[PDB]
């Protein structure tokens, strides 16, 4: 089946840019990608409460929400919660991306061959 | 006596008494001690002329980054100061000011001062942005629109000296 | 590379023949104020900034151009009185006319004079007379707008325009008071 | 050597740190030196000190211990050698003449560009009896950056030893535990190093973005 | 809960309204302050104003009757996890103020110390400049939250007020790009 | 052994901590067995942060560290950057009596915010209302003569960022007569209180000798009876021209610490009389103008600004003056190269600072030895042992200001 990844900032320019580095179908070894795009955090956990999702990259710097504190409560709210990815807006946040447990963390600016070979790695 | 241990009950008798001293804020908002750092407020010459030379001392100043201003040429097109620069973009990232007052003292031309205005709060990151169209003080009477030529005669040092009227 | 050896100040050094005061001061860490002067350039000695007391000479020397003999003493504005004040004087003669410009000057906050009369000017402006001043700024290419009001007639670009480059484009025009670079007419 | 400690090495007028913004101003080379020993007649009762310490001390271990001696605006220095820290510090404590009772803390400040004497502690002593007060100085290279602590001579330190570890990484070897005081015990790098990015982000605004003021110029 | 079950018609309505009003009027904050801005947010609770008037002066310590947080500080990278647990620690429904510039963007100390908005954290209700915000300043963000609780909607509504949020949103061009008259 | 002791955190978030301290208690029971601190809730990278800053500008950032005693900090800032400038003989009469007069009511208001805080702890909750009824008379003034209530940047390196307002001398004498009447309002609920005695009397006990050994300073140290003041021994800022009281106590607990804070305001109460006393008319800027701040703050009908006689100058006719503002308000002063340790008496102890100059127009290096930090190491000693009732009313009476501890 197709899978679907969540991928959660409210500026759109950073879901562009995820949707790039990710490709319909990235690693063609693997099943095709679907984009469920959020920019609220509300409507990010409501998604993830309804699940089926193989991924969440959460921007960590969404403006009204981060993407770290929405990492942290989806994994303390959801079972089976799904891996989760963060951006980072700075190289020293990754010490907050390493107690959001979210499974990596991807520096902005989003590098592409970066964040794919890191989905690659959780949808694996 | 003992009596000097129980002070305190005549004091909050005492204070149930004479009367509450609470500011009545909002309905009555309490007095703002006249050198407030209120919000910064971007001002005009009697003219309408914008003060603000766009010279970016005042962001220079700014411990806090909280400044960000574009300077552009004034031209007998389209004139917003006297002189040769103007502040074409001015914004106040009141999310990052820390009310300092540094920039005021940083300004050479008085364009920025601080009102005792200070309410201020939004829902948004980005509404707390305060651009030049937000700042810039009301038009008061007898000026015209920014986009003008200097006052017939007068010349920016004129503006400087003060020496301008409607 | 004959080493010619001479005190700066109180201190002394050696430094190969036929370098200049400037340069020597530069090395042993002495920031004798200078506009004209250019490393690059040959030197001038026009804005007359770079004074310094040299023993056995009545006048200030540019140290811009005064070559380093043996044996010689200088005294720079930070030991010798005289060649503080000689600078001081150069500095406000500078200053005179100069645009009241700063926050409007793209310079502000690089500028040399700026720097320079901090560090070498006096607190405040005795100058209560006219300045000159020039309608400005005017482009001499598509690409390079003069303001002759702030120039301080170093001649550093037209000595460049010709030294460095074959490009005697602009030069030093008028007199008096009135000199200014520019373009030919409109060249 | 009573040369003086270069902490940096200016280059160019108007204190530029890289090309500048005009040509021909960078060739001046001002080297930052911080003040050298000084010269013997110490005001005030510096000399009253450091003559008493050099009587507690012998004159090979004064020698040995002692490495400078900086008075600069009426406050003295005292630029220790390491690992005779602890001797000296306990001959300061408990000598009648000088009682130094307390240690105020230790501070460490970093000069990457001081060879060998990369990172120093400075120790605030004061002497309530006396009402004297001094400052000791221990230089450690980055390689090396162990230092003896002086916890059995001045307990105040211990906070202070590690504060200045976790800021700087100076090892304050035979102190009880050299954890992390302020930054989480799991955060990678000293913050208070030059080397240490000061880690900010672009401030926001309509249209742009402001990087922090470590990568703006500055002079 | 049961209360938001009610069908959309005028019962879920007056409930919404009821509910705010009541949930507008007894705000109480946690006792949670953290800096600077602790200091004002105590000074607002002082006599020289009352908090207690707008029905906040049970300024609650556990963290479970707690309903408001105004973070009213700088969050350190240190306290980032603990500022979070006290906000997952309070039950639903709960409001955050980012009171200060430290709070709401990281204010002046944008260094690695400090986590640049507690939004990174928790979500922000409100945002307040000052450095510290007075004590008017603090009222008047806290009667902007009354006014956001009291048009708060409930159940079906919502969950529509969700989704009309989440369609907004994903339109509103970044900040990066509001290039003005910035040339 | 273990099995009956429980570990704690009175955490971060607890009513008595202030938010951002971390004491880790090991109870048998209840009766406090190790008190283990944890520290950096609160670090805010300030000391690393001022260095990309120039310096009177880092004035912005060192008022925010200890946010209860700004004038202090800023006092011990500004002290340092004339020290490094050799300015501390050329700072005008007014601006040294001003900075005092500053200081002594921000000691008022940090020990009224200390009891204040204290009492809503011990469960004296109308000690926090009494208590910032007076603050709020002082903060009002503060307010009036820098225009912030607190985090001031008033007090700048050679001088003051302005002068009084012309009300301002008036705001202080009310003050002056007020807040000995208002004080006692606060000290009829403490002082004698059986309840308050009981809670605080013995409690947090600490010999001089721990204090030493810690480096304790401030009230704690005083209340085991030292008359050990930064202000008497090593004067500065001109404190050497008041006549005022070291306050002490020989109670070496917390009852007695609360004492030195409740005398330690009527003290300087009496050194602000002082100081409008002794406040003749004058600069309150170092008239060196290749130093001076050059903005000159003057309200008017469109609100604080520069003053219309300044921008007239530097704009229309001062060419030096305007390269000066330029360049001081920009860049900055530069500081020769060298360091610095000069400390002052904050209301918590001796606030030091330790600042290095490498030449520049931004400081290399301004450690502070904030008090509270040191004072915290107190923690273990004055609560091992005792009651967790009793561990709070000591580490209320360390009255420690977390800003500064973590800095
Ligand atoms: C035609 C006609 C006349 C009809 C009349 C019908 C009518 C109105 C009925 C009257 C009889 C009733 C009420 C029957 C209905 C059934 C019923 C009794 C339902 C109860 C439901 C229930 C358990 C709860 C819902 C709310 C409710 C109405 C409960 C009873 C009333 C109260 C007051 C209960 C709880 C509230 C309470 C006492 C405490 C709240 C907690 C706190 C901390 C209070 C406030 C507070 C306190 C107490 C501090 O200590 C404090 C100290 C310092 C600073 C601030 C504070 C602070 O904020
Ligand atoms: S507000 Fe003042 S300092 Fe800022 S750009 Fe305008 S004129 Fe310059
Ligand atoms: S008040 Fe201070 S922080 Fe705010 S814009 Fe003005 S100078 Fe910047
Ligand atoms: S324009 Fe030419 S002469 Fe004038 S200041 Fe510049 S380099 Fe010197
Ligand atoms: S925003 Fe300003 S006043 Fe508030 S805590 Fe931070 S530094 Fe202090
Ligand atoms: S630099 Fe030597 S005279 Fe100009």
């Given at each position: 089946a197709?899978?679907?990844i969540?991928v959660?900032?409210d500026?759109?320019?950073?879901?562009?840019?995820?949707?790039?580095?990710?490709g319909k179908?990235?690693?063609?070894?693997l099943?095709?990608?679907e984009?469920?795009d959020?920019?609220?955090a509300?409507?990010?956990?409501?998604?993830?409460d309804?699940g089926?999702?193989?991924?969440?990259?959460?921007?960590?710097?969404a403006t009204?929400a981060?993407g770290?504190?929405?990492?942290k409560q989806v994994?303390?709210?959801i079972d089976?919660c799904?891996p989760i990815?963060?951006?980072?807006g700075?190289?020293d946040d990754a010490?907050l991306?390493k107690?959001?447990?979210?499974?990596?963390?991807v520096p902005?600016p989003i590098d592409?061959?970066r964040?794919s070979d890191?989905?690659?790695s959780?949808?694996? | 006596?003992?009596?000097?241990?129980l002070?305190?009950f005549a004091?909050?008798?005492?204070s149930?008494f004479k009367?509450?001293?609470?500011?009545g804020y909002?309905?009555?908002?309490?007095?703002?001690?006249?050198?407030?750092h209120?919000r910064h407020?971007?001002?005009?010459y009697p003219?309408?002329?914008?003060?603000?030379?766009?010279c970016?001392?005042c962001?220079?100043?700014?411990?806090?980054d909280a400044?960000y201003?574009?300077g552009?040429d004034?031209?007998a097109d389209?004139?917003?100061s006297?002189?040769?620069?103007?502040g074409?973009?001015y914004?106040?990232?009141?999310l990052?000011c820390?009310?300092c007052?540094?920039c005021?003292?940083?300004?050479?031309?008085?364009?920025?001062?601080?009102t005792?205005?200070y309410?201020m709060?939004d829902?948004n990151?980005?509404?707390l942005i305060?651009?030049k169209?937000?700042?810039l003080?009301?038009?008061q009477?007898?000026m015209?629109?920014?986009?003008?030529?200097?006052?017939?005669?007068?010349?920016?040092?004129?503006?400087?000296?003060?020496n301008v009227?409607? | 590379?004959?080493?010619?050896?001479?005190?700066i100040?109180?201190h002394?050094?050696?430094?190969?023949?036929?370098?200049?005061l400037i340069?020597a001061?530069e090395?042993?860490?002495?920031?004798?104020?200078?506009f004209?002067?250019?490393?690059?350039?040959?030197?001038?000695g026009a804005?007359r900034?770079?004074?310094?007391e040299?023993?056995?000479?009545?006048?200030?020397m540019?140290?811009?151009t005064?070559t380093?003999?043996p044996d010689?003493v200088?005294?720079?504005?930070?030991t010798?009185?005289?060649?503080?004040?000689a600078q001081?004087?150069?500095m406000e003669?500078?200053?005179?006319?100069?645009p009241?410009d700063c926050?409007?000057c793209?310079k502000?906050?690089?500028?040399?004079?700026?720097?320079?009369?901090?560090?070498?000017?006096?607190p405040?402006?005795?100058?209560?007379?006219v300045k000159?001043?020039?309608?400005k700024?005017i482009?001499?290419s598509s690409?390079?707008?003069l303001d002759?009001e702030?120039?301080?007639?170093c001649?550093?670009?037209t000595?460049?325009?010709s030294?460095?480059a074959?490009?005697?484009?602009?030069?030093?025009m008028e007199?008096?008071?009135?000199?200014?670079?520019?373009?030919?007419?409109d060249k | 050597?009573d040369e003086?400690?270069?902490?940096?090495?200016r280059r160019?007028?108007?204190?530029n740190?890289?090309?500048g913004?005009t040509?021909?101003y960078?060739?001046?080379?001002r080297?930052?030196?911080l003040?050298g020993?000084?010269?013997?007649?110490?005001?005030?009762?510096?000399?009253?000190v450091?003559?008493?310490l050099?009587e507690?001390l012998?004159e090979?271990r004064?020698?040995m211990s002692?490495?400078?001696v900086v008075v600069y605006?009426?406050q003295?220095?005292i630029?220790?050698?390491r690992?005779?820290?602890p001797?000296?510090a306990?001959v300061?404590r408990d000598?009648?003449?000088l009682?130094?009772?307390?240690?105020?803390?230790?501070?460490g400040?970093?000069?990457p560009?001081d060879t060998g004497?990369?990172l120093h502690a400075?120790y605030?002593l004061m002497?309530?009896?006396?009402?004297?007060?001094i400052?000791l100085?221990?230089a450690?290279?980055?390689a090396?950056?162990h230092?003896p602590?002086?916890?059995?001579?001045?307990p105040?330190?211990?906070?202070?030893?590690?504060?200045?570890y976790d800021?700087?990484?100076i090892?304050?070897?035979?102190?009880?535990?050299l954890?992390?005081?302020?930054?989480?015990?799991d955060?990678?790098?000293?913050?208070q190093?030059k080397?240490?990015p000061?880690?900010?982000?672009?401030?926001?605004?309509?249209g742009?973005?402001?990087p922090?003021?470590?990568?703006?110029?500055?002079? | 809960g049961?209360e938001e079950?009610?069908?959309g018609?005028?019962?879920l309505?007056?409930?919404?309204t009821?509910?705010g009003?009541?949930?507008?009027?007894?705000l109480?904050?946690?006792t949670?302050?953290?800096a600077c801005c602790?200091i004002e947010?105590?000074?607002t609770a002082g006599p020289?104003?009352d908090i207690?008037?707008?029905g906040?002066?049970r300024?609650?310590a556990t963290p479970?009757?707690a309903?408001?947080?105004?973070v009213?500080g700088?969050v350190?990278?240190?306290?980032?996890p603990v500022?979070?647990?006290?906000?997952?620690?309070?039950?639903e429904?709960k409001?955050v103020?980012?009171?200060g510039?430290?709070?709401?963007?990281?204010g002046?100390?944008?260094?690695y110390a400090?986590?640049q908005?507690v939004?990174?954290?928790?979500?922000?209700?409100?945002?307040?400049?000052?450095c510290p915000?007075?004590?008017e300043m603090?009222?008047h963000?806290?009667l902007?939250?009354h006014?956001?609780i009291?048009?708060m909607?409930?159940?079906?509504?919502?969950?529509?007020?969700?989704?009309?949020?989440?369609?907004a949103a994903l339109?509103?061009?970044?900040?990066?790009e509001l290039?003005?008259?910035?040339? | 052994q273990a099995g009956?002791?429980?570990?704690?955190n009175?955490?971060p978030?607890?009513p008595?901590?202030?938010?951002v301290?971390r004491?880790?208690?090991?109870i048998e029971?209840?009766?406090?067995?190790?008190?283990?601190c944890?520290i950096?809730?609160?670090?805010?990278?300030?000391e690393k942060?001022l260095?990309?800053?120039?310096?009177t500008?880092?004035?912005?950032?060192?008022?925010?560290?200890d946010?209860?005693?700004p004038?202090f900090?800023?006092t011990?800032?500004?002290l340092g950057?004339?020290?490094?400038?050799?300015i501390?003989?050329?700072?005008p009469?007014?601006?040294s009596?001003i900075?005092?007069?500053?200081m002594?009511?921000?000691?008022?208001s940090?020990?009224?915010?200390?009891?204040?805080?204290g009492?809503?702890?011990?469960?004296?909750?109308?000690?926090?209302?009494?208590?910032?009824?007076?603050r709020?008379?002082?903060?009002?003034?503060?307010?009036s003569?820098?225009?912030?209530?607190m985090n001031?940047?008033?007090?700048?390196?050679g001088?003051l960022?302005?002068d009084?307002?012309?009300?301002?001398?008036?705001?202080?004498?009310?003050?002056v007569?007020?807040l000995?009447?208002?004080?006692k309002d606060?000290?009829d609920?403490?002082?004698?209180?059986?309840?308050?005695?009981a809670?605080?009397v013995?409690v947090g006990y600490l010999?001089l000798?721990?204090?030493m050994?810690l480096?304790?300073?401030?009230?704690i140290?005083?209340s085991?009876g030292?008359?050990?003041?930064?202000?008497?021994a090593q004067?500065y800022c001109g404190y050497?021209?008041?006549?005022?009281?070291?306050?002490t106590?020989?109670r070496?607990?917390?009852?007695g610490?609360?004492?030195?804070?409740?005398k330690?305001?009527?003290?300087?109460?009496?050194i602000?009389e002082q100081?409008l006393?002794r406040?003749?008319?004058?600069?309150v800027?170092?008239s060196?103008?290749?130093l001076?701040?050059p903005?000159?703050?003057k309200?008017?009908?469109?609100?604080?600004?520069?003053?219309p006689?300044?921008?007239?100058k530097?704009?229309?006719?001062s060419?030096?003056?305007l390269?000066?503002?330029?360049?001081?308000?920009?860049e900055?002063?530069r500081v020769?190269p060298?360091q610095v340790?000069?400390?002052?008496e904050?209301?918590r102890?001796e606030?030091?600072?330790?600042?290095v100059?490498?030449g520049?127009?931004?400081?290399?290096?301004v450690?502070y030895?904030?008090?509270?930090?040191?004072?915290?190491?107190?923690?273990?000693?004055?609560?091992?042992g005792?009651m967790?009732?009793?561990?709070?009313?000591?580490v209320?009476?360390?009255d420690?200001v977390m800003?500064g501890?973590?800095?």
């Open positions: 197709p899978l679907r969540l959660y900032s500026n759109p320019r950073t879901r562009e840019q995820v949707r790039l580095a990710l179908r990235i690693h063609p070894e099943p095709e990608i984009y469920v959020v920019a609220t509300p409507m990010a956990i409501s998604q993830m309804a089926g999702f193989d991924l969440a990259i959460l921007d960590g710097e009204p981060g770290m504190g929405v990492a994994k303390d709210e089976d799904p990815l963060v951006l980072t700075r190289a010490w991306a107690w959001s447990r979210a499974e990596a963390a902005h592409p061959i964040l890191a989905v690659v959780l949808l694996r | 006596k003992f009596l000097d241990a002070a305190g004091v909050t008798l005492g149930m009367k509450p001293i609470t500011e909002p309905e009555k908002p309490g007095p703002v001690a006249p050198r407030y209120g407020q971007l001002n005009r003219d309408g002329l914008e003060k603000c030379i766009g970016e001392l962001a220079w100043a700014c411990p806090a400044i201003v574009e552009a004034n031209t389209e004139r917003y006297p002189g040769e620069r103007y074409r973009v914004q106040i990232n009141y990052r820390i009310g007052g540094l005021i003292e940083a300004c050479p031309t008085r364009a920025l001062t601080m005792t205005e309410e709060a829902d990151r980005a509404d305060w651009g169209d937000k700042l003080a009301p038009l009477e007898g015209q629109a920014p986009p003008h030529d200097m006052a017939p005669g007068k010349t920016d040092d004129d503006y400087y000296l003060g009227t409607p | 590379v004959e080493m010619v050896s001479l005190t100040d109180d002394e050094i050696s430094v190969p023949k036929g370098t200049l340069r001061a090395l042993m860490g002495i920031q004798i104020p200078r004209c002067d250019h490393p690059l350039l040959d030197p001038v804005c900034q770079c004074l310094v040299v023993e056995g000479q009545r006048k200030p540019a140290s811009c005064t380093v003999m010689m200088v005294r720079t504005q930070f010798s009185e005289a060649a503080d004040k001081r004087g150069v003669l500078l200053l005179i006319n100069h009241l926050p409007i793209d502000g906050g690089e500028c040399p004079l700026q720097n320079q009369a901090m560090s070498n000017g006096r405040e402006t005795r100058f209560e007379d000159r001043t020039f309608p700024p482009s001499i690409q390079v707008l002759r702030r120039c301080v007639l001649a550093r670009c000595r460049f325009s030294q460095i074959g490009d005697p484009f602009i030069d030093l007199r008096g008071a009135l000199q200014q670079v520019g373009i030919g007419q | 050597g003086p400690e270069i902490i940096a090495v160019g007028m108007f204190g740190r890289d090309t913004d040509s021909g960078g060739r001046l080379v080297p930052v030196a003040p020993s000084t010269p013997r007649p110490y005001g005030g009762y510096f000399d009253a450091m003559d008493r050099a507690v012998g090979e004064y020698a002692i490495e400078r605006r009426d003295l220095t630029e220790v050698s690992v005779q820290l001797a000296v306990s300061l000598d009648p003449d009682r130094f009772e307390l240690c105020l803390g230790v501070s400040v970093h000069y560009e004497r990369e400075v605030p002497s309530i009896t006396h009402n004297r007060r400052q100085e221990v450690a290279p980055d090396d950056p230092i602590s002086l916890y059995a001579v001045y105040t330190t211990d906070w202070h030893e590690r504060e200045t800021f700087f990484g090892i304050f070897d035979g102190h009880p535990s954890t992390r005081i302020e930054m989480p015990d955060w990678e790098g000293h913050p190093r080397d240490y000061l880690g900010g982000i672009p401030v926001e605004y309509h742009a973005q402001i922090p003021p470590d990568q703006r110029r500055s002079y | 049961l079950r009610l069908p018609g005028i019962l309505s007056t409930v919404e009821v509910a009003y009541v949930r507008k009027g007894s109480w904050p946690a949670f302050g953290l602790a947010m105590m000074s020289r104003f207690a008037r707008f906040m002066e300024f609650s479970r009757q309903d408001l947080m105004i009213a700088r350190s990278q240190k306290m980032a500022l979070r647990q006290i906000y997952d620690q309070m039950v429904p409001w103020l980012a009171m510039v430290c709070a709401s963007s990281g002046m100390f944008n260094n400090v986590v908005g939004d990174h954290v928790v979500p922000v209700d409100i945002y307040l400049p000052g915000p007075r004590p603090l009222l963000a806290i902007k939250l006014d956001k009291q048009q909607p409930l159940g079906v509504n919502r969950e529509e007020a969700i989704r009309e949020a989440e369609q339109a509103v061009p970044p900040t990066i290039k003005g008259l910035l040339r | 009956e002791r429980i570990v704690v009175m955490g978030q607890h008595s901590t202030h938010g301290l004491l880790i208690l090991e029971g209840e009766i406090i067995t190790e008190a283990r944890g950096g809730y609160l670090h805010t990278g300030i942060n260095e990309y800053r120039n310096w500008q880092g004035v912005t950032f060192v008022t925010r560290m946010y209860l005693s004038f900090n800023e011990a800032y500004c950057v004339e020290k490094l400038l050799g501390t003989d050329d700072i009469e007014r601006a009596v900075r005092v007069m500053l002594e009511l921000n000691r008022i940090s020990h009224l915010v200390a009891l204040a805080t009492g809503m702890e011990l469960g004296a909750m109308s000690a926090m209302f009494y208590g910032f009824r007076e709020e008379e002082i903060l009002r003034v503060f307010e003569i820098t225009g912030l209530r001031h940047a008033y007090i700048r390196p001088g960022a302005a009084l307002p012309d009300d301002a001398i008036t705001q202080v004498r009310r003050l007569e007020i000995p009447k208002r004080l606060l000290e609920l403490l002082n004698e209180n059986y309840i308050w005695k809670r605080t013995g010999d000798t721990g204090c050994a480096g304790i300073t401030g009230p140290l005083r085991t030292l008359p050990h003041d930064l202000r008497k004067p050497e021209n008041y006549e005022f009281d070291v306050i106590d020989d070496c607990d917390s009852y610490r609360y004492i030195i804070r409740v330690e305001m009527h003290e300087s109460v009496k602000v100081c006393a406040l003749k008319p004058g600069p800027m170092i060196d103008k290749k001076a701040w903005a000159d703050l309200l008017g009908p469109d609100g604080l600004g520069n003053s006689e300044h921008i007239a530097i704009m229309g006719r060419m030096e003056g390269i000066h503002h330029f360049k001081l308000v920009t900055g002063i020769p060298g340790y000069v400390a002052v904050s209301p102890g606030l030091g600072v330790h600042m100059s490498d520049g127009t931004r400081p290399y290096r450690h030895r904030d008090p509270s930090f040191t004072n915290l190491q107190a923690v273990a000693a004055t609560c091992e005792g967790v009732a009793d561990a709070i009313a000591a209320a009476s360390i420690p800003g501890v973590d800095r």
